[PDB]
Amino acid sequence: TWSYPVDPYWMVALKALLVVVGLLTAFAFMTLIERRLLARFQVRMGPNRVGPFGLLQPLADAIKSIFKEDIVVAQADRFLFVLAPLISVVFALLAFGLIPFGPPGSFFGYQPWVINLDLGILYLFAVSELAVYGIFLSGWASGSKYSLLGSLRSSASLISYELGLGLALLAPVLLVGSLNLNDIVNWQKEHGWLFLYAFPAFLVYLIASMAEAARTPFDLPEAEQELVGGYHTEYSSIKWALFQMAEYIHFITASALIPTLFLGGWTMPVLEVPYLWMFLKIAFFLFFFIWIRATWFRLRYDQLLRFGWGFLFPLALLWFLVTALVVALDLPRTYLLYLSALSFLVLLGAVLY
Amino acid sequence: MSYLLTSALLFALGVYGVLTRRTAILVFLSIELMLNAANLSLVGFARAYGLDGQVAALMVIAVAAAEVAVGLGLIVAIFRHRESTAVDDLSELRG
Amino acid sequence: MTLNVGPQHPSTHGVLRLMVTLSGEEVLEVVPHIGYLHTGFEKTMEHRTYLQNITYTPRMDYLHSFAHDLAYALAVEKLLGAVVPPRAETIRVILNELSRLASHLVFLGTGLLDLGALTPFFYAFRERETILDLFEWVTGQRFHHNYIRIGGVKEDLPEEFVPELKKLLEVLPHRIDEYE
Amino acid sequence: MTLAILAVFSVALTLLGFVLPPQGVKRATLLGLALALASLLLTWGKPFAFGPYAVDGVSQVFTLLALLGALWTVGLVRSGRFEFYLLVLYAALGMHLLASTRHLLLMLVALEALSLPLYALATWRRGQGLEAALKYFLLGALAAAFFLYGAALFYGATGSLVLGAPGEGPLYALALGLLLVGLGFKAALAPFHFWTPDVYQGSPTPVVLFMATSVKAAAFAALLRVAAPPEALALLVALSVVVGNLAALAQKEAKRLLAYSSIAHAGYMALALYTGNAQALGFYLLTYVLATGLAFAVLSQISPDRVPLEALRGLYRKDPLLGLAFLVAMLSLLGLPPLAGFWGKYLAFAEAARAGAWGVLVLALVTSAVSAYYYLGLGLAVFARPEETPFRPGPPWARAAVVAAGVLLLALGLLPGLVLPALAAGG
Amino acid sequence: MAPIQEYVGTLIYVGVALFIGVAALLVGALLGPKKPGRAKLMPYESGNDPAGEVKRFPVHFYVVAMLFILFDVEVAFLWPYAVSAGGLGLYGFLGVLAFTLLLFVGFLYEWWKGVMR
Amino acid sequence: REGILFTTLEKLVAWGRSNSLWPATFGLACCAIEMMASTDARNDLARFGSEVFRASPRQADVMIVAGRLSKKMAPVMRRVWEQMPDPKWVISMGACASSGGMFNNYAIVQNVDSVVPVDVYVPGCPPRPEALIYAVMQLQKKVRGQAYNERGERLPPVAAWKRTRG
Amino acid sequence: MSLLEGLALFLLLLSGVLVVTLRNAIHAALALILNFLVLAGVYVALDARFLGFIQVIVYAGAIVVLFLFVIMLLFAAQGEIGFDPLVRSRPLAALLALGVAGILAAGLWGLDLAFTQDLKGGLPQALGPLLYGDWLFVLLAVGFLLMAATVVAVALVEPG
Ligand SMILES: COc1oc([C@H]2C/C(=C/C(C)=C/c3ccc([N+](=O)[O-])cc3)CO2)c(C)c(=O)c1C
Ligand code: SF4
What residue intervals traverse the membrane (chain D)? Predict the structure, then answer.
């Protein structure tokens, strides 16, 4: 926060409240839109019911979720059973402020974001660990080892790719040299779209975000189709709703961070509108991701672990070494454009054999 | 200065744990608390003497990571087939 | 870990109980427990006339049922010496292979969904839906059709059956090639 | 730049063990350690410092001793696990870094780097070996916490974490005490000695050889850097010697008795700490290392898991050279003329009296005279009647090594004016 | 760098998120039929013993977590070089490369041994 | 609190529970494949709100007895019903479940109202997917209090609310 | 300062009391994570910023997570089995627990210190040239130590 102002604390509290309730509405309507887009994918059509376009169905879902006999299962830990959903929701809500939705004042006067910490990516990493925390804690608390093993699967796999997230996020820092997202986005305004320099690491970031229950390991797991997952299967009225809510908020926050960090956080080269381009890129990644949601299988978390550990992370640290050589000797930055273009051509042309 | 007194108090608390705790895991947790009390004192004295105690505490965290890894591997090796990790069940070696 | 992969849960289609004797992520050995659908065909059929039992036969294998109808029919035809008209035989092989396509569709859709992806369940099922219409054309029923008889089949094919069959037979090869 | 040799050999062999048989990795470790020892020889009198890494007489002497013990104990180890060799290399480097630095935090890193493999090397899988490993690990982590809060309070007394700082009053004393706790723990000083008998008794004999040579050498090498006040030194010496010898009287097992003996000898060595001579102490520890490595190589030829006192007996009839060497070693560990144990004892006692601490010195001497009870129950026992005892009379490797060690003990006892003139800069 | 005001704004962010989550918990818990049953409170799966009596879970998760702690320490050490990189020149670059090669050798060992175990 | 005691809120929560009916499948026999077919891309019960399908019983309100209920499965399914949150409904699908069906013997429960409280009965063999849509709409208006039987009575919103569990 | 300082110290001390008194291993580790959060906040208040972020990331995110992984693999929550209770040591330890504090308090009591240095926040921007440089030797030693730690644990468990 070298150059960025500070709104009063009451504005911070107000905007946080706005972000929380907007994330409610957002995840409800995104569940609707994902249903309908899946429908378009699998021929069938969606709920032209309670809406018309479905836009009163989240209300029915929320009203059903409450009054649903929120039960505390016996043979379960009285404390963690209740405490884990709150953890999973709290440590999911936050870490959305830093994503810049415009230049300062483009919130009709004050601030597009909430907080602009000096060290942002570390804050994101730290609160991202805590989602796995709530997952496996809730698994333990339920008193059902069928969910315990699912929680252990979740935590192991997510933790492997969560380590990989660090080797992914190293690459652009060497270039910019700042850990505040606004400086990084402004760098992406100057030279342009950081992934152009670091496309390989970009990949291993993107794929890493897929491991966080987004889809295609899909061995989080969910109770369905396999050794049942954790953090569910024992929660009835709101705590399950809180798990679904926090997991989807993590989904959409990650799908928004992917363009924010590597690609063009809003900051478009032309037409420079504050919010709309960020929202459209969020929707772009969401639509590609839903394509993936419909179109691909599971990974069984054995090949997933082997792939993350042996394949993603050595490759990411190799790219880190290359970029660190380039930055420390600082000779051009264009060499990185050339190398990333060649790397993408390799990782693409090797497909059509 | 209150922070360094608190570091000493946490050192004492980890000591009370290590003495009182029956299982290896809780003893090791108390030791982690002791090491972090030391880290707090190092951060204070780095604020007083110029920031080298911060990198010192960083290396301390690394040390804790290495010894946590090794201690948990050893614990598994001894008490995987064995019953409760309680060390009072191991009294073969006496003076 | 002698884990109780119970009847119908989790997603053991075709209610079946499993005691997976298993430590870890490997599989030592699975001990099965079945009978959770025992309804009594071998016994109830001893109290139903041969004509009636054609109502009990398809419902055992509810996916590929005309094989059950055909097995029962043929065995009784041999036992009392019945004559298959050529047209009845051709129709019986039509319904046999078509119910086989439907059973196969359901099998692969269930296999893909059971672990992995959800989408290809629908497309195959789409075709299955079309097939059912064909059956509803001649038998008036989706499945569990009581159409076959000891001598042959109940009554004749409608005028509208064959063109729909040609339509589905022309669209299908590309569809199966797509699945593969 | 011998540390470069150690790092290179360790890191290369770490992967090469996947392509090389344990025997090939063993021979490679032997070559690497021998080359590091030779590099130490060619660098005698060539001080070399880069950062906190500072090579002085202590560094050279004690790292030479540690490499000697490592080479010896590798000579005995033939297990089909390359890991059981790699750790040795690792421990070596670690102990090297312990003696070659003045930075307190780098001292902590070296303590961890040398202590981690030593926990695991004692796992012949015997349940008592695991009991010893757990006792060792927990008490060592406690001592690491103590040492760390001592380094923190040291930084509280001065702007640097390097020893040689002027130092304040009570806070500096407290910091130095909290450093001395862990360092003497590594050096088997009482009242921190409880781990030593259990660990020496539970672990396989060659591992205890490696311990009783290199651990004690490196621990005193790190101790000399500390400016320990004489009163705490008197407390440690008195408690160590008294309890060590007394409780060693009542012991029935060879390894446990010898661990108590090592406690008493660490109490004796701590007398040079009155003057911090580092010449006399280098010589003393050279003799003690040689003798104890010899004895434990023989004990390994007798029994890895545990050796009773009767097992030592009749060895001369079994092996002449081994019995002679064990007798000589027992007398040198008693510090008797004309053996080098007597020169080391005399040099430490001279430094202590020169500092003017009289009651402590006399008490150490009276208790060392008391020690003849078991020192003689061991040294002379070589000639007794062999009772039932498993006995594997070794290869020629260890026999020649034992012979050289004993000959050198007696030679440095007779004529110390050969090497002792060169334990300082090394003319 | 960044002012401390953003950090109290962070604390308020957390307090607001926590307060709204506790509010959602209150809404869920207070609104309900409240008819407990013995079988309802039973864990799962048809009579007893969904998993029931099983031996301790596989250690592979311990291996993964330990791997993660050591390599996350690695990443924490790599970050100060990530920010202050050009100021360290080829000397700092070469030092960080050696560090990375050492821990990558540790990975290479654990991989050539592999953990399917 | 049972979704009652307010002229507006009981209508609101009945609206919510009725439209957001989340089925808990218990696939047993050939009725259950006609239950699956009610979700494919020709005739899908994926519109009224039943898109998602909570396999766990702790999360779903509608349990559909879909197939012949063999006696060795009676108690398990019982507990599956007891493993449901209290605001739960049960539809009896098919002839084998509603009555004994054609299998009138020692192996089948001759009316599943024995083990579970049934909301709606739906005949057919198997009842056409469209009859299943009609039954879920029947239950929709039943839990709003918009259901009357042949005898002139309005039916309670939730069956399994009138039974002294034990 | 003191307004929130008292709160942070009370949370730290109460969390320590929890982690050393409670018999539930899970509750103890959880209280230790609450402790680390309070302590990273105190670090932040001490102008040590980067270290607090690593404290939350590494300690809470990684170490105690593995603690929880093992104790959930090996239940171990009901520790009081195979007691040999040794009741007298519970109050006696408190004595020693007081003692190991008192002498420390003596070293720090009557001690005034210069807590005045413009650290400008403990950012890694300034910690880099220290780490690679004056501390590079310790860094390389730490990295090799971590490699040795991996090898030790791997050769240690290695069922075969
Ligand atoms: C699987 O095949 C089969 O099943 C059954 C039972 C089990 C069953 C499960 C699920 C998971 C349905 C389901 C499908 C799709 C969704 N969805 O949301 O898309 C939801 C739920 C339905 O009938 C029987 C009896 C069978 O004999 C065969 C061959
Ligand atoms: S009513 Fe007919 S379709 Fe349904 S389970 Fe019974 S036999 Fe099968």
Answer: 1-21, 30-50, 57-77, 79-99, 104-124, 137-157, 172-192, 204-224, 230-250, 257-277, 280-300, 322-342, 360-380, 400-420
Q: Would you call D421 exposed, middle or buried from its count of C-beta atoms within 10 A (0-12, 13-18, 19+)?
A: exposed
Residues 6+ apart with CB under 8 A from D339: D287, D328, D331, D332, D409, D410, D413
CATH architecture of E4-113: Up-down Bundle (1.20)
Instruction: Please tell me whether F96 is known to bind a ligand.
Output: yes
With a CB cutoff of 8 Å and minimum separation 6, the contacts of A31 are A58, A61, A248
Contact A135, A154 (CB under 8 A): yes
Give φ, ψ of D391 to 5 degrees.
Answer: -140, 120
- Per-residue CA distances from D195 to D92, D270, D417 (Å): 22, 19, 37
Element (H, E) at F64: strand F62-66
Picking from E50, E53, E58, the nearest residue to C24 by CB comes out as E58
Measured distance CA(D138)–CA(A274) in Å, rounded:
58
Nearest-Å Rg of the Cα atoms of chain A is: 21
Q: Where is F63: in which H helix or E strand?
A: strand F62-66
The tokens of A226 are what? 């396999």
Element at F92 (helix H, strand E) = strand F89-93
Q: Mind telling me how many Å the CA of C40 is from chain F's nearest CA?
A: 6
Q: In what order do the strands lie in the sheet with C29-33?
A: C3-5, C17-21, C29-33
- In which residue are the tokens 């009978």 written? C35
Q: CA A16, CA A111: separation in Å to the nearest integer? A: 12
CA distance A224 to C11: 6
CA–CA gap between residue D279 and residue C64 (Å, rounded)? 95
Q: How far apart are CA D402 and CA D298, in angstroms?
A: 8
Residue F96 has, within 13 A of its CA and on its CB side, a CA count of 25
Q: Record the resolution, in angstroms.
A: 3.4
Q: Which of these, A16, A194, A3, lies nearest to A104 by C-alpha position? A: A3
Do the strands C3-5 and C17-21 form a parallel or antiparallel pair, or are they unpaired? antiparallel
G78 in Cβ contact with A146 (< 8 Å): no
Q: Which are the contacts of B70, defined by CB distance < 8 A and separation ≥ 6?
A: D116, D119, D120, D137, G149, G152, G153, G156
Instruction: Return the structure tokens found at D296.
Output: 């434990």
Across the interface, whether the CB atoms of F13 and A63 are under 8 A apart is answered yes
Count: domains in chain A: 1
- 3-state class (DSSP) for residue F166: coil
C with G: touching (≥3 Cβ pairs within 8 Å): no
Supply angle C-alpha A153, A157, A163, rounded to 5.
145
DSSP string, D110-155: HHHHHHHHHHHHT-SS-HHHHHHHHHHHHHHHHHHHHHHHHHHHHH
Domain residue ranges in chain G: 1-160
Method: X-ray
CB contact under 8 Å between F128 and C43, yes or no, is no
Q: Which residues of G64-91 are buried (b: 16+ CB within 10 A; e: fewer)?
A: bbbbbbbbbbbebbebeeeeeeeeeeee
Question: Tokens 């027992």 sit at which residue?
Answer: D330
The ligand with the least distance to the CA atom of C65 is 2
Q: Find out whether the peptide bond into C10 is cis, omega within 30 degrees of 0.
A: yes
Q: Which ligand does the CA of C58 lie closest to?
A: 2
Measured between its terminal Cα atoms, the distance across chain B in Å is 44
Q: Which residue has the tokens 């009242």?
A: D191
Q: Helices D359-370 and D340-354, interaxial angle, to 10°?
A: 160
Q: Which tokens hold the place of E24?
A: 């959602």
| Ligand 2 atom at minimal distance to the Cα of residue F34 | 3
Min Cα–Cα distance to chain E from A320, Å: 9
Distance CA A311, CA A314 (A): 6
Q: Which domains does chain F have, with CATH numbers?
A: 1-160 (3.40.50.12280)
In single-letter form, the type of residue at position F23 comes to P
